């Protein structure tokens with residue numbers, strides 16, 4: 001595939017979003033749930049890619065969960081409990097903007113999880129996801145990669161953006177210094193939890209338009225593959 005100008009990007013995006021709406025109706029009709037994980041550094045473009053992914057999908061059929069730090073009430077349970085509570089029904093879509101993989105990313109880097117906790121978490125997470133995918137759930141995980149210089153450009157845009165500058169803090173700037181550790185943790189995560197039933201898709205995120213298109217294409221492709229594995233064929237169930 002090639003990069004496209006804005007008009008052709010818009011047309012390709014519109015077709016892919018129609019196909020995503022159709023795929024949602026297909027998964028609902030066949031009562032197969034869909035779980036999408038998004039991870040990546042601050043300003044990697046997770047939020048915008050999610051917005052394009054579900055923009056034309058029926059709002060009754062999905063929930064986007066913006067995941068932040070566990071609250072004190074959530075820490076009274078196992079770290080996966082707050083995520084168990086958010087799982088979609090069969091036939092519904094759940095999007096996790098950050099996810100249980102925080103156990104092996106920010107919580108590992110910041111020392112919130114002990115060494116034993118994050119060390120054993122890879123197989124705990126594999127086993128959890130396998131429970132779901134052996135039943136009636138499809139899981140895809142996306143890592144949006146962004147360069148340090150592109151992230152810096154986006155931080156400066158945010159600090160000049162009246163809708164976003166209130167949220168950018170000195171702590172975020174300082175956390176940019178921890179990026180090497182995050183990259184190492186993400187690479188170990190990829191090595192240990194990239195599974196056939198629950199793949200990691202690495203998304204080239206420096207160009208937002210390409211990232212949005214790729215997220216849509218990869219979601220649709222894995223839905224079609226998993227449909228085939230289940231003896232079903234994705235067709236147009238809209239018209």
Ligand SMILES: Cc1cn([C@H]2C[C@H](O)[C@@H](COP(=O)(O)O)O2)c(=O)[nH]c1=O
Nearest residue numbers: 067068069070098099102103106107112
């Ligand atoms: C998303 C997330 C953040 N955190 C921590 C990191 C920071 O100390 C704090 C706020 O992070 P945030 O500003 O990126 O949401 O919460 C966790 O411990 N676990 C998580 O899953």
